[PDB]
């Protein structure tokens, strides 16, 4: 049963489809796809073949499919041979020893041209080092309508099938002892929840069996569970290890989080770069304007909509809290994150989220909070500015070379909880001509002392009514305002910033142009206790609490 397992995957070249092969190798029982088709034979080999995809979407996405193969599959056009979308992951394949299977497709064509193709699947297949294949053997030949070079050629539809057998091992994985698995792939349906699939790392898995989550410690129950056969996954009672088995009901559930039996057991390490940085609440809009200008609120709506981000999104990660109406996601990237909040804010979604708290994660020891690589080019005098501010962000400064006509370069290294805010008074301090993007790097030990903050804090509002020059006018002689000559606001939503560390509850209804503060420059300003409305047309800065004793009353 086990050791007759093979855990391959398929490389397709520029043409899609290789069936041709991935087809007709149904041939035993047993456009297109794709994910697991595992056939099966003997002169039984269950041999689960998973489709890595022509694409690379972003973040880790095909190092995490060949965390369940042991070997692969490259299929190259004899006509042509192999291009830049195989070049994708075949470096990512060798970094895992998966020793390889060439395959010299469309044999038959009349342009073809096999063993010059193989001397390029030579000269650019070993420059990438290896060290071995050598062998590399595998090597066939194959058309798809199914005399030249190996064999050659009887029913050329079994000669692959010794490759897989005889270069291809069995997953070595413990068929006994309490059960583990690490999740590999990730998918969504309108009413399973979330769904596994994986490669079954130790033990065996009962479909109403009670388990355990990892890298935090949800304790989820399973319900249903399924194998794969044909193109089909198909229900199973029970299934032991080594497979790709596919699996439901359990919560949430997500791509890397590893997860085992109840006794006995845990845990599952294998990051490898695909843990999240960052991570926000994301709350369904309980403000003033519920359904108002937005047609997506009922929170069952919105899980819905994240759940299904989850299958494309690899460097995402969503979990679930004790309050119904709320979701801490997690990504790698604030910048990952808001794609997700203003792609949702333009299909039309009404929800809230918090301030982006880092993930303060630990490797050894020191709780080593995320760093990055920034850059940044200003005009000299700005430079004063700009360099005073980020040594109070503890921000460590690297290289700065001085371009000489004018401007200069300079290139920091800043830790993330201190990054938080910068890009608004970057663009102040230099008055636009301050241009920077930046890049993530690593974590780091503590910065250490949180000094993350912001402050001072904002005007808070008191009326659901419009905003007049008779009011504003006067209050913008506390500080600058984020609303000009007419707009209904509530109780709770800031309406602009103070002067100084003062928090105040003023009424705008019994002038300056204001501020133009953007999805990204609301949320990377907030703080904890604050949380940002975001409708599909406006964009709100809502206290959670939204009244002057419902302030104090909170504060214990
Ligand atoms: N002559 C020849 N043509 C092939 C062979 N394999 C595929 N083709 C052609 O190349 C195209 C790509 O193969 P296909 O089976 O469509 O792969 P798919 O994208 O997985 O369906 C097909 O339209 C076939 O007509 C082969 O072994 N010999």
Not at 379 to 401: F, I, P, T, W, Y
Not at 436 to 458: A, I, K, M, W
């Amino acid at each position: 049963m086990i050791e007759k397992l093979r855990n391959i995957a398929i490389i397709a070249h520029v043409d899609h489809g290789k069936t041709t092969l991935v087809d007709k190798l149904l041939q035993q029982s047993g456009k297109e796809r794709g994910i697991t088709i595992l056939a099966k034979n003997t002169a039984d080999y269950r041999i689960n073949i998973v489709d890595t995809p022509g694409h690379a979407d972003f973040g880790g996405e095909v190092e995490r499919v060949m965390s369940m193969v042991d070997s692969v599959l490259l299929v190259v056009d004899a006509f042509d041979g192999p291009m830049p979308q195989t070049r994708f992951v075949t470096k990512k394949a060798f970094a895992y020893g998966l020793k390889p299977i060439v395959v010299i497709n469309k044999v038959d064509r009349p342009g073809a041209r096999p063993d010059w193709v193989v001397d390029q699947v030579f000269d650019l297949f070993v420059n990438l080092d290896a060290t071995d294949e050598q062998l590399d053997f595998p090597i066939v030949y194959a058309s798809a309508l199914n005399g030249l070079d190996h064999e050659d050629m009887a029913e050329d539809m079994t000669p692959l099938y010794q490759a897989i057998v005889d270069h291809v091992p069995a997953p070595d994985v413990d068929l006994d002892g309490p059960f583990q698995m690490q999740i590999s792939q990730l998918d969504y349906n309108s009413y399973v929840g979330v769904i596994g699939i994986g490669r079954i790392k130790r033990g065996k898995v009962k479909p109403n069996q009670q388990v355990t989550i990892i890298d935090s410690e949800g304790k989820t129950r399973n319900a249903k569970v399924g194998k794969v056969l044909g193109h089909l996954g198909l229900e199973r009672i029970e299934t032991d290890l080594a497979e790709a088995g596919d699996i439901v009901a359990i919560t949430e559930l997500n791509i890397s989080d590893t997860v085992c039996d109840t006794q006995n057991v845990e845990a599952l390490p294998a990051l490898s770069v695909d843990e999240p940085t960052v991570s926000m609440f994301f709350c369904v809009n309980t403000s003033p304007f519920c359904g108002k200008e937005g047609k997506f609120v009922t929170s069952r709506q919105i899980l819905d909509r994240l759940n299904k981000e989850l299958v494309h999104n690899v460097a995402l990660r969503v979990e679930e809290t004790e309050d119904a109406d709320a979701f801490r996601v997690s990504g790698r990237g604030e910048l990952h994150l808001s794609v997700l909040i203003e792609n949702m804010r333009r299909e039309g979604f009404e929800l809230a989220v918090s301030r982006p708290k880092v993930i303060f994660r630990e490797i050894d020891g020191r709780k080593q909070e995320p760093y990055e690589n920034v850059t940044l080019d200003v005009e000299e005098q700005h430079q004063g500015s700009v360099m005073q501010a980020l040594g109070e962000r503890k921000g460590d400064l690297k290289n700065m070379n001085p371009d000489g006509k004018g401007r200069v370069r300079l290139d920091y290294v800043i830790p993330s909880r201190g990054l938080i805010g910068f890009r608004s008074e970057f663009m102040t301090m230099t008055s636009g001509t301050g241009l920077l993007y930046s890049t993530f790097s690593h974590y780091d030990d503590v910065r250490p002392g949180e000094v993350g903050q912001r402050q001072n804090g904002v005007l808070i509002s008191n009326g659901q009514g419009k905003a007049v020059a008779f009011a504003l006018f006067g209050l913008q002689d506390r500080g600058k305002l984020f609303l000009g000559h007419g707009a209904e606001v509530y109780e709770g939503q800031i309406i602009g910033i103070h002067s100084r560390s003062n928090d105040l509850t003023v009424n705008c209804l019994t002038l300056v142009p204001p501020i133009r503060m953007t999805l990204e420059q609301a949320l990377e300003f907030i703080d904890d206790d604050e949380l940002v409305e975001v409708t599909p047309t406006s964009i709100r800065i809502r206290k959670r609490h939204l009244t002057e004793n419902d302030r104090r009353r909170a504060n214990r």
